[PDB]
Amino acid sequence: DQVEKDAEDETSSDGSKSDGSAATSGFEFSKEDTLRLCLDIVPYFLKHNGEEDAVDLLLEIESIDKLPQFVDENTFQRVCQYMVACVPLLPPPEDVAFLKTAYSIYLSQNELTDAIALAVRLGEEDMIRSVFDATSDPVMHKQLAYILAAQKTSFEYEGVQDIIGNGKLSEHFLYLAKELNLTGPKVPEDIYKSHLDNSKSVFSSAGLDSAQQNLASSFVNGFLNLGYCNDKLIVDNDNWVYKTKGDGMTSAVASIGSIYQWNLDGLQQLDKYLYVDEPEVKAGALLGIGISASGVHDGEVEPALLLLQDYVTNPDTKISSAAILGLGIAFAGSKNDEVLGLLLPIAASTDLPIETAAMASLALAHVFVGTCNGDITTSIMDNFLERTAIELKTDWVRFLALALGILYMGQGEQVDDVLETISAIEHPMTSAIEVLVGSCAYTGTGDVLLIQDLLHRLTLAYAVLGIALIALGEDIGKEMSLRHFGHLMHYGNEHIRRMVPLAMGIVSVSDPQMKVFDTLTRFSHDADLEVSMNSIFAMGLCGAGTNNARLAQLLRQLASYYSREQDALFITRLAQGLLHLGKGTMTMDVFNDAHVLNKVTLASILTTAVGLVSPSFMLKHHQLFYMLNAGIRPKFILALNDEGEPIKVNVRVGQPVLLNHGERAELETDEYISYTSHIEGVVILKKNPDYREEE
Amino acid sequence: LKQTENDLKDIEARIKEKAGVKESDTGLAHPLQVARCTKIIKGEDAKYVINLKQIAKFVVGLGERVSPTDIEEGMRVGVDRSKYNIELPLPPRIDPSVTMMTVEEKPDVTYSDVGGCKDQIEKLREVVELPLLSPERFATLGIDPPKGILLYGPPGTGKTLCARAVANRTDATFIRVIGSELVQKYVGEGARMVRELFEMARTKKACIIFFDEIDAVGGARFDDGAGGDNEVQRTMLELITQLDGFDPRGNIKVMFATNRPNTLDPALLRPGRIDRKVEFSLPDLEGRANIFRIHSKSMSVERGIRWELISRLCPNSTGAELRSVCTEAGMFAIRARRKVATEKDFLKAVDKVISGYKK
Amino acid sequence: FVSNSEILKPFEKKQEEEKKQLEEIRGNPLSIGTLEEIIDDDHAIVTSPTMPDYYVSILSFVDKELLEPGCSVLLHHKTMSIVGVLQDDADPMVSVMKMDKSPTESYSDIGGLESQIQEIKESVELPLTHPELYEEMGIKPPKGVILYGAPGTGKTLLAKAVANQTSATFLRIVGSELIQKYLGDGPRLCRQIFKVAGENAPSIVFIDEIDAIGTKRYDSNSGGEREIQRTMLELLNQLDGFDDRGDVKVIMATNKIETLDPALIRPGRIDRKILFENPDLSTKKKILGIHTSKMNLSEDVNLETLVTTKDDLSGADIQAMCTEAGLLALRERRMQVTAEDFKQAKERVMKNKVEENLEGLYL
Predict the structure, then answer these.
(1) d(CA A681, CA A150)
(2) Please, which residues 133-162 of chain C have a Cβ atom closer than 8 Å to chain B?
(3) Buried (b) or exposed (e) across B249-266, using 16+ Cβ within 10 A?
(4) How far apart (Å, rounded) are the C-alpha atoms in residues C80 and C32?
(5) What GO molecular functions are on record for this protein (chain A)?
(6) Given CB atoms, is B33 within the 8 Å cutoff of chain C?
(7) How many Cα neighbours within 13 Å face the side chain of A22?
(8) What values do phi and psi take at A230, rounded to 5?
(9) Residues pairing with B277 in the sheet
(10) DSSP-derived 3-state class of residue A317
(11) CA torsion A331→A334→A337→A338, rounded to 10°?
């Protein structure tokens, strides 16, 4: 009762990692007379080996300060096994807050099971790095580094990368220079790019004659040659490049960026078109560099992408349109004060003919995602309510409210700037944002007020984002949520409509369900023809790379649209074009082996949802067709020995019969034994102490 | 649209409920499943007054009148179970039985589970394939093919795909009628369904009328032969008066399927209607081998296996037991974690059928 | 309450002058019936359970596509007109229908049956969880499952354990109730089983304790029935007509399959045959650990002591031994069963409480 009364008013969640504080400052939790109670049962159960009943006593009183007293010396393995089936769920409800004090005393041990529980649920930054704290072996940290590349989230920006990635000698850091390039898609995508040179197929590309037909073939030149390096059409014959002007020239050089994409250098290759004469021929240069830099953030051996900060703000119309879209993709996961400083006046004035700020809002959430920035939410807050300079259009103002949705993640107490934007202008999607800001404000979710606030909003479309995290972490709120999910799918906006099958398609590889695909019948026809335009594209994006199979129920949804008019041909072919994405062979994986989802990849999915205007109605520029190359993840599985070195090891092959470093494979199970945190795909195996083997 | 259809009860339905109910219910009384009249005096000519309910049955005398369009008042007019006098021209033939009828013209089925059944095809070659191809040959022979053809064998095997294989060579129309679905709450559904089969067989020459599960109908049953209602009792009339008397033997043919011959009416088993009795045997070593090689095209296997040794270890089996060998072959591959079924998987699938059944 | 007052409440406030009054036009005197034939003339045939067959008209509520023949609809008392459509659950579909959500039994509580757990998973749970194994092989997983043994052990625990991991509702259908000894009720109750589980495929069909439809004999007497011949033969068409990816399975239990119709069997539709196996040493150990967790054991009671002398009783019978050991503790008025109680319990359970005696001399 002393904690529950103080649990409603506080700046954080339950639990603390400080074992030397009496909790007498501010809100009082443990009184002074409870000092003897903490040590009361300590000498008893230790000598009697009564830890079975001793743990159950700490679960009743919920005292986190008693945990380090029982763990002192002798066997540390037996006390961890009693924390598996007991500590996480004693009662019908579930309290995971007891892991806060477990980080300090188990710092040198932790557990194989507890390490997974720390990476999920609350998901604190210090909890994800606890896997490197318990083990001092730099070899064991290697296998944990490859899963960190697909992890992103907490540790992304220069706080770890670009600093420790040059190698370090210490206890729980141990990040070598190999883990810098090899774990992330930097060197492996370059070796993968060289693999497509001998794997190339027949190319239909040509130079044709007129520039009108070159624009139609420019999209094919970048789509067919994606991943393959071709110097014949670039250096030799420029007829399909120089003859195009305006939006055609930007889309022409944009195909060059996809040709050189996933290479060690994506800048100096395009410097030929960087400065020629007009801003029209200079526009596609900055766009292709960012497309070619997709997959790498801080560079391989050098931070080469930091030199593009001066290319952001340009008074030219064509360059500024291709600079924000191209550089916003390459700068993802890396925070910069100079890049943000030049993006503040662009998004403030929202000047279409000069600054081209239409895509500047989505770039702010795509770049700084996963980082900690308090100046980006404050500067926009003043420009959101006042709307200074020439800012007029309200849709671009609403785009800022959706742009800040990703910005307050991991900001802690800085989420108050988002609350001021909700009370300023009322938006349909901002009503549920004010509730979910407490996830990163309290450094976790699942509290008492957090659950009650969700039941008040439901009994709108954005509230289901935090419910799914609590439903998986709480069985009580999961049953009442499943009944609410059915009635929420009917709403004016399609946000609640399109997100339900998206989350189902992610887990469709494990537990497929056709009940969601039946409700989509109403999703196809709503009011106007613009509803059916994004309906086929949404059903085709989640079904990219799969022919029927578990999508057979979804096939009946797209069967209602075959041939209607000339404009309907472009609408029905949206799903057909996505089936061939990745030269016809692609496997989309938005998650990892940690039983969580990658929010950096999901951030690019929401960016393309608001974007991609050129395939939809009201086509503006032809440079938006290349946005699909941003969310494409490199498909490979690296073969490693017990030491994690790039050497050929004979094991079960993946999805391509020879497994080596740089070979394309995905979705392969691993039944063998590893060091810690056993994962599929890229894995470092070991051998029992009896013998020495790499399998 | 939602609020538009709500107030139609006070405006449009007032006329609809008056003409569709009050006129039909007038005097304690357009698909018609029911008709009733109570104390109607009309001057022999358009008298009607027929109660379709089994209680208080009526008749119509004093001459004969034919009015297929409108008998008396229109509205409620029915026949249902008992046919009375001049009420014949307007039978209540409406029923959602379209799900029961299956009509396939020139089936494409050749050999799937029927591989090796050519022995039974030769039994159906003379009395079925020959008249449906060159019926003029029987003019010089002096005789004609018998009316019906009886099928016999294991239950649920050989009565489905084997009948469509003969229709391929003759390019005939295969119509399968399930006998268990002929029995419904409507009395006379079995007899009325057989009526429409001969009507469609007269328009198009060389058609095959197949009756599936005749044991559920037969020539007589408890509710008809031993009962007062007429459904199967009137079904036998359509197989005698129509087929034998009016319908020529060359163009129109009839075939049944049954587990036992004694389950039918001994009146039908007599010569003149049901003559040819086709017994379904089991495929031999060559027949069982051609079935496995066809199923191996849709199932991933090893290119170096042999389908002849697979069918050799397995004894004579039905059409289903042979398909079980291929389906179970993939189950043993799951234990070994293989994408294709090797030769050892088929050997274990045969032993699973031999040991698991022992029939 | 707060969100719905500012959102859903004002939606009906503007329509309060219409939606409130226009819904009262139907009235309080309304009835229910079953559809027969639907046409575009706004007239149909409705039948109430009292069989008042009438030819009525159709009011405008929903389009004719949403009116399905054979489903319960909302009717009127006097005019018997069709004012709308209702849910089909009012149809007397199956005589005994029970949907059990979240079954209690699982694979860990059934003992040493893991040899049969991986085998039953392939025919039921595997195509539900991972159909791609059968999809890459281009084959259809077996829909049916044949059970043997005794009830409570192999005919019960094995049925409720597979429904737990599949996260499907347990649907029990009595086998003896499938035959009403009436013409037309046999195929009717069989088609309604796949209808309730065939919409979203939420559950799995389970059938247990068949002493009746399994044996038709030769005649309606001597334990068999004539309606069994038509019911089993027509049920085969429902097995082949039903097609899915394995979200719905059919598990039937019978003592002997020799009396079954080889047509309804149709090998390749049912690839799963579960034979009763004798419990091993690990079976009793898993049953004891559940009850001995809440039951305090003395210092002379160990795991290898209780399994030393055993007849290989099933997982259920071992539970009866733990209850008898606790019954002797109530005689001495204590909550901790000592080792002296198990010695007298094993003699009473396997002899007095279960009469076997193991008749010898080659028998």
Answers:
(1) 11
(2) 133-134, 136-140, 142
(3) bbebbbbbbbbeeeebbe
(4) 9
(5) enzyme regulator activity; protein-macromolecule adaptor activity
(6) yes
(7) 8
(8) -130, 115
(9) B150
(10) helix
(11) -30
